[model samples]
Target: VRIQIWHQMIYGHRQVLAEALEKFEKENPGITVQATYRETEELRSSFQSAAMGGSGPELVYGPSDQVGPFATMGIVRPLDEVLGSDYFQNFDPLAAPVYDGKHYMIGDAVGNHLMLLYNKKFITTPPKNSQELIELGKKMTVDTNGDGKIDRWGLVFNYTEPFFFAPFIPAFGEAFLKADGVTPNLNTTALKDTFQFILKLRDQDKIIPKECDYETANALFKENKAAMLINGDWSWGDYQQAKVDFGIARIPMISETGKWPSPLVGTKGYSLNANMKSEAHYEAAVKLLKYLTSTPVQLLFAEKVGVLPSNLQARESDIVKNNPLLKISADIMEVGTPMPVTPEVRAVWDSLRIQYQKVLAGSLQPQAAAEQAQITAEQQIRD
Candidate 1:
């Protein structure tokens, strides 16, 4: 029977996985691996549904934060015992989970960071930081349709994801969440700077389009209707195919005096199924995983997919230097905080999104949202 390999990505590495599996089967005859990638939300829901019915991926692919939740549920194997030095030495020590001082999940890739991508045709010299961005955005935003209404947006902001908001708080010398990963300081002066900065982009500058969701934001960028988009390293495939002339830059600081905003670093790697149907399958699962994440394959995949490598050795490989996006992505890793590792932390992230959306919609002011998030965090902590 074929090995089931599950992935959750929309466009980028999913294509690379198809190529990787093809190569894997060619090299190792009599072994077949199947692959699937879906939108993140659907994949999460599907995982819950499948597990209830005794059907699920033999292996799961997602951000490293899932390690805490999955390990607690006893749903994944401890990968160290299976692959040993072969896979161990290839990945950086930071790649796998160190939950309670033990490792789970084989690390395959390191980064999925947001960057500023601009259409070079319209935007020749992109902003170096927040101050410059504000000035340039004003010039770039224009009524291209001549309908006396703003048809082309200046910049796309709040594109529907809490992750995008992570970069801004740091500009005011503030971390978005507390160290324990609860207690949002929404009304703090630093956060006021963050929200005010965002609001200025909206109400004052008329830069970001009003109420643009993720889909519309990306579409506007792809179709060349928007001047700029703050997005992820995973856009290489589509941009390459579209042959759009573009450039990627780090997030700008809020002001000349403020620090550069840094995004949270989220990683996607492979985790084994603790509920493997059989020990024989479990043993085979380990071998198959080793093949998937081994240095040679991961390095190849990173090059094809255009993201940072999970393996430390792969980081030094030629692929690192070839892609400008990957090189800058590594730099961001130094400043980027990891998503909260605990399941409780995941709850905190979810709540933050709700509060942020409320603030954006004017249903709740920023201060109220922050205070409610703190309350929610405390309840989650008690639970």
Candidate 2:
């Protein structure tokens, strides 16, 4: 039997996955597993094209957010029918997500949440709240040789991105989405305040660069030109390989609202393709899925890559329990919101990104951006 998986795992995680696949092949006689890597958006688009033509990989692995679009299009099968009700018992509820009351994917790890990552060589203790963040950031911003251009920054991140900025919306006093999860909550004071917050950090505080892309911030942090960084665990290995000693903590609390910034937590998972070639292929794929999420394999990835294993049993092992970074990273996720797995979320994010970028570039005010974000999201969803 042969099974195929198409995935978008980052470099470090992909290596661990390859090792696990090799292990699985050696243990399961007569069954071969092959995985192909694709970039994130390309994977989603290509999978849709393949599914429309009635063929694709047996499994598609990526972020849980893709579940909404795939499930809505009827391109991915619901796992509840095949795995049965009891199968999800050992996994974190966040790992097995339902779209329209059907499990569409199974995650091996729970993460993708933004947190405060600080270089320990510069800062001994991390900031606890927004006020402290600004004050400490100001102190850390340094000028060398009396030059007008600062040599080091106190804070750096891809602040223009919507996902990176989403955490502040809740900390400002309202969730970005209502309890229903799909409705846009962009017109509130929280959204306006968050937009203003970034402006203050850049213009008034002067702790961050005027325009920082992902690679710029990452490169700056790696070169010891930054005191602190707001990023996700996915990039931890990059810093580690760069020889930066960093510590992970939750994004600071909002002093005004007394609430912690709620980074969105998402489980990157594997979803079954609806267009399976035959029953035998489906069974082989299921076995491969179970093997991938099994305790031993989960531990191997967890131990190697510092991921929060979705398997409850693997999480309880000494490997997860003893890893300091994973321990604090797990606690940082306590205040995190689960990423909304709804098709409309794409519209919400698009609108937020558009309006927020305009505000940053001085083309729009925070108040107008907030109002426009709602309008844009509603229109996008309608279209």
Candidate 3:
């Protein structure tokens, strides 16, 4: 028997997954597993094309956000029929979420939320709230020489991207989506306030760069040219390899609202493809998924990659409890909103990205951008 898996796991996690797959192959005798790596955006497009051709890898592995779009297109099968109704009870509720009252995917770990990452060499203490953050940023932004240009930045992140800037919205007061996840709530004071906050950081306070994207911000942080960075758990291994002494903390509280910034928390997991070749393929694929998500296998990933396992039993292990970073990560995740796994979320993010970029470039005001975000989101989804 042979089955295939397509995944978008980064380098370190990929190696750990390969080890786990080797063990599974040895245990299951005649069965062989083939795993292919794809970059995130490519994985989505390729999976859709493969499914349209009446064949695809038996399993697809990626972030939970993809579930909504895949499920909507009927490319992924609901697990209720294959894994049975009570199957999802084995993992944390966050790992097994229902999009349309059906289980489309299951995760092996949790705590994919973003937080403030600071280099310990320059800053001994992290800020607890917005006022302190601004003060610290001003003090840290320095030009060691008498040159006109700033040599080091106080704060740096991929602020040009919507996902990186989203955590601040809830801290200002509201989420981009309503509780139902289908309606857009972008036209609010919270959205405008969050926009103003970033603008102030760049123009008035002069703490952050006028323009920064993911790669640029990442490079700056790694080179110690930036005092603070906002990123997710996936970057920790990269930072470790870069030999940077760093500490993780919650994105500071909003002094006006007294609320902590709420990063979106979710999981990366596996989904069964609806277009299985045969019953044998489905059974083999199910067996492989179960083995991959098993407590022992998740423990292997946890030990090698430092992820927080979703299996309740695996999470209780001394490794998870003892890891300082994972412990603090859990604390940061406590205030995060669950990542909305709905198809409409794609439209919302797209609209928000377009309008928000215009605001940053001075073509639109924050108030107008907020209103246009809602209008454009509805138009996109409706079309």
Candidate 4:
């Protein structure tokens, strides 16, 4: 039987997956695989629709965030059995999210967190803490060409989504949700510092621009409009395309007491389709997934595409060994928290982002926004 996999992408990413597929075909002589690619939104819509109709792909590279919704709906199943019976020894704690007892997907390749990417042309030394980061932002934030507009920004505050806001939240040592859906903790001691520190970067240092999204910050960095941007491996390809003088580092701490900045953990892993008709095909699928995620393949993907491997042993892979950005990224992943696995977790992002926007905009105080965020989050978690 043939299996179809649906992949979502824009451009460069499409090319990388094509290479992986070539590798897959080389290993399997009789079994054939087909790939369907679309924009992230269109593919998601199509996948969700096909899934609702019980005709979805045998394997889907769905978002880490969306996994919770699918599992809650009972469409996605836990891979604990496969893990226990197969490559359980290779699991990377920071690479995949554990849902209930089993991880739902084979993820170590795509999920990302914030890391400092810098231009070698601008600054020689990297900042040790958030305070020094701000100081460097001030020094490099000048437009050497003297354009009337502020041409070069010191930092690009990645506010495209709550994921961009993740570094700040954890610096305060607060989580988006407690394990229980009802208890929320946005107004804690550390979280307040995170919020304040972010505000200071904006209000006092004048580092990041107003209302910049992922695309904007990326373009700014590519064009040298910004010197530093906190982002994950997803953008590494773009920077390589732009051919900018850049380097990567771990995000800094807000103060001596605050936790080191942690990025939101994103991952994909192998999962079983609960409704498959044949157990043999299911077994074959499991075998293929394990083969695909083997140390060799994992290293291939990471070296060729900059994706982090799922196995800790694979850290010695060429990609992780050579790149400082990926090294820090893997390190931060070790300390990062998994995203919440409940339906209400979506609500947390929506509500928390709007509240933080107010804080960033200086319209609301950090404590007030955090307190209100906590209250609204509690309601949203239960609702």
TM-score of 1: 0.90
Tens-place lDDT digits, model 1, residues 258-321: 5777776766778877666666666666667877787777877677767666777677877777
After superposition, the stretches of candidate 1 with alpha carbons farther than 4 Å from their true spots are 28-30, 52-54, 180-189
- lDDT string for model 4 (113-185, tens) is 6677887778667786877888889887775667745778899856636667766675666565665753566
Give per-residue lDDT, candidate 1, residue 146: 82
Off by over 4 Å in 3: 29-32
TM-score of each: 0.90, 0.93, 0.93, 0.82
Better of 1 and 2 by lDDT: 2
TM-score-superior candidate, 1 or 3: 3
TM-score for candidate 4:
0.82
Candidate 1 global lDDT: 0.71
List, in order, the clash count of every candidate structure: 2, 0, 0, 10
How would the candidate models be sorted by lDDT, starting from the highest?
2, 3, 1, 4
lDDT for 192 (candidate 4): 66
User: Which scores higher on TM-score, 2 or 4?
Assistant: 2
Residue range with the least summed lDDT across 10 consecutive positions in model 3:
82-91
